Amino acid sequence: FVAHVESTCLLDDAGTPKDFTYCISFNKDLLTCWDPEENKMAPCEFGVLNSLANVLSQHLNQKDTLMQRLRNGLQNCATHTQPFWGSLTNRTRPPSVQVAKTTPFNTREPVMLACYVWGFYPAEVTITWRKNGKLVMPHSSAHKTAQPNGDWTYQTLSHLALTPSYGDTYTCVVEHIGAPEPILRDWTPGL
Amino acid sequence: LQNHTFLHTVYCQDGSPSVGLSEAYDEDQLFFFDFSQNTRVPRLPEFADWAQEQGDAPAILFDKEFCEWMIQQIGPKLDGKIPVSRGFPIAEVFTLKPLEFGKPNTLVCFVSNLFPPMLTVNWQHHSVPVEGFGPTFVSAVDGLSFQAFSYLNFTPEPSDIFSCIVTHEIDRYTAIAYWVPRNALPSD
Ligand SMILES: *[C@H]1O[C@H](CO)[C@@H](O[C@H]2O[C@H](CO)[C@@H](O[C@@H]3O[C@H](CO)[C@@H](O)[C@H](O[C@@H]4O[C@H](CO)[C@@H](O)[C@H](O)[C@@H]4O)[C@@H]3O)[C@H](O)[C@H]2NC(C)=O)[C@H](O)[C@H]1NC(C)=O
Ligand SMILES: [Cl-]
Ligand SMILES: [Cl-]
């Protein structure tokens, strides 16, 4: 079996504690959590593990140190995250971007471009395409979903299927809070 | 002013590691606790200075012991009574940066849906074992779940073929994800 004793803190960019939870789980079943408007642990599971949920709530509620600790959950959250919180909510890393050809898929077009965006943080990033300076594929999803690398950087890519014409220039426009100005990468059939 | 989540997960289990503690800021891991070393370990060097503060040792101790208490005291009693929750690990492998032959890169092996949190990851190059860069980072995520990241530094070549082998520890299941060089970016 696996068991959990999980605490969560919700704070804003400034470090102001907005919420706080403390929940116990067993066998991936959420059983009992702290109830501020009751000052004690209260069952969350009413299925087969209901009695266990009440037993765990009981044992924990008889722990004065824990009760006093949870009563101050909000303050504990602010105090504990205080030394680093500001550095995190302000943390950003600009994206690197490169355009190049890729094997076409799910399309009839002969050519397919891939705009690679990586090394950025946070994960929110927008990518749009421009043909000879004008927007294209307006009905696409500019707000992209990104793959986490696990080291506080992310990556994603946008595609553009097309037929080349030697005079056309395609530009990948990347916007990310980690970069003051949009990032542009050009591509032409003769490159 | 948007909200952000600080996740502090103390977990324990029948198996190795018997107990763990993972902390994350939104989707990313900040620290993991080494109980054999009595200390927080930073996910990144830049978090090293923050991994020193130990103002919450008693809370960690309290949560740790209560967690181990449920696995030890309760559990043997539920053994047979309820079905053990288990999830097959899903592994995916990809390069940290866009592929460019002859240029240093790093292969990432991301494991999700891991439950219970017991695993071993092995890297291979053409069916040949090869040691990875640094440790495998296991972290807790919202929803009572776990994930892991492993890395391998290498210089890609046209004939390369790599694989990440994930063993849901103690032979529960084995997953394999393959990586092949494709759509390499043109070199200068
Ligand atoms: C992230 O941080 C906080 C995490 O919870 C969150 O805090 C508040 O979120 C809601 C703000 O929209 C609060 O909802 C209120 O809850 C009250 C208690 O039930 C309600 O009485 C209240 O009713 C509404 O009042 C409005 C104003 O008159 C009215 O327009 C509505 O029609 C309705 O009558 C409202 O629902 C919530 O309680 C707060 N959470 C806490 C502290 O417990 C932040 O909102 C969130 N911030 C961001 C940027 O996402
Ligand atoms: Cl805490
Ligand atoms: Cl949307």
Which CATH number covers residue B43? 3.10.320.10
- Cα three-residue angle A103-A158-A120, rounded to 5 degrees: 125
What gap in Å lies between CA B167 and CA A7, rounded to an integer?
Answer: 29
Q: How far is A76 from chain B (nearest CA, A)?
A: 9
Query: From CA B43, how far away is CA B7, in angstroms rounded?
Result: 14
Q: In the sheet that A147-148 helps form, which strands lie side by side, from edge to edge?
A: A96-101, A111-120, A154-162, A147-148
The answer to whether residues B164 and B91 touch, using CB atoms and an 8 Å cutoff, is yes
Give the residue among A4, A2, A27 at the shortest CA–CA distance from B15: A2
Residue to substitute in A9, A10, A13, A18 for testing ligand 1 pocket (most ligand atoms within 8 angstroms of CB): A18
- Whether residues B22 and B62 share a domain: the answer is yes
Q: Under a CB-based contact definition with an 8 Å cutoff, are residues A97 and A117 in contact? A: yes
Query: Which tokens go with B135?
Result: 């440790």
**A115 with A97: CB under 8 angstroms?**
yes
Which residues, including other chains, have CB under 8 Å from residue A185's CB and lie 6 or more apart?
Answer: A97, A98, A99, A115, A171, A172, A174
- What 8-state DSSP symbol labels residue B81? T
Q: How far apart are CA B26 and CA B5, in angstroms?
A: 5
Question: Are B121 and B49 members of one domain?
Answer: no
Is the domain of B84 the same as that of B165?
Answer: yes
Domain boundary, last residue among A90, A123, A154: A90
Query: Do residues A79 and A127 share a domain?
Result: no
Amino acid in the structure at residue A5: V
| Contact status, residue A32 vs residue A42, Cβ threshold 8 Å | yes
Return the best residue to mutate from B2, B3, B26 for the ligand 1 pocket (most ligand atoms within 8 A of CB): B3
Range A165-168, long-range pairs (CB < 8 A, 24+ positions): A165/A189, A166/A190, A168/A131, A168/A132
Residues whose CB is less than 8 angstroms from the CB of residue A188 and which lie 6 or more positions away in sequence, other chains included: A166, A168, A169, A170
- Judge: B2–A12 Cβ closer than 8 Å, yes or no: yes
Where in B2-104 does DSSP place strands (E)?
3-13, 19-25, 28-34, 39-42, 90-95
Contact A21, A34 (CB under 8 A): yes
Query: By the 8 A CB rule, do B95 and B145 touch?
Result: no
Name the token pair of A82: 């205080």
Amino acid at B125: H
Give phi and psi for B145, each to the nearest 5: -120, 175
A62 and A138: one domain?
no
HSE at residue B16, side-chain half, CA atoms within 13 A, is 4
Own/partner pairs, B25-31, CB within 8 angstroms, 24+ separation = B25/A88, B26/A122, B27/A123, B27/A148, B27/B141, B28/A148, B28/A150, B28/A152, B29/A150, B29/B137, B29/B139, B30/A84, B30/A88
Q: Tell me, yes or no, whether A61 and A134 share the same domain.
A: no
- Is there a contact between B185 and A116 if contact means CB atoms under 8 Å apart? yes
Resolution attained, angstroms: 2.3
Cβ contact (<8 Å) for B84 and A81?
A: no
State the CB neighbour count (10 A cutoff) for residue A79: 14
- Nearest residue to A7 via CA among B138, B53, B59: B59
Phi, psi of A75 (to 5 degrees): -70, -45
Range of the domain at B45: 1-79
Rounded CA separation A120/A112 (Å): 24
Are B27 and B92 found together in one domain?
no
C-alpha closest to that of A80 among B6, B77, B14, B9: B6
- Residue B105 in tokens: 């890169």
Among candidate residues B33, B184, B161, B22, the one with its CA nearest the CA of residue B93:
B161
* B70 membership: H or E segment, kind and range: helix B57-72
Range of the domain at A80: 1-90
How many domains are there within chain B?
2
Distances (CA, A) of A138 to A64, A127, A142, A184, B16: 60, 11, 9, 18, 51
Q: Does B96 lie in the same domain as B185?
A: yes
Q: Is B65 on the interface with A (CB under 8 A)?
A: no
Alpha carbon distance A10, A91 (integer Å): 17
In a shared domain, residues A138 and A173: yes
The answer for B 131-170 residues in CB contact with A (under 8 A) is 137, 140, 144-145, 149, 151
Q: Which two tokens stand for residue B168?
A: 């849901």
The pocket around ligand 1, CB under 6 angstroms, is made up of A 10, 18-19; B 2-3
The strand pairing partners of B142, in sequence order, are none
Among B49, B79, B109, the domain-final residue is B79
CATH code: domain of residue A76 = 3.10.320.10
Q: How far apart are CA B63 and CA B55, in angstroms?
A: 15
Maximum distance among all Cα pairs of chain B, rounded to whole angstroms: 66
Method used experimentally: X-ray
**Does B120 lie in the same domain as B56?**
no
Nearest residue of A to residue B85, measured between CA atoms = A27
Which H, E and C letters describe A125-185, residue by residue?
CEEEEEECCEEECCCCCCECCCEECCCCCEEEEEEEEECCCCCCCEEEEEECCCCCCCEEE
Count of the separate structural domains present in chain A: 2
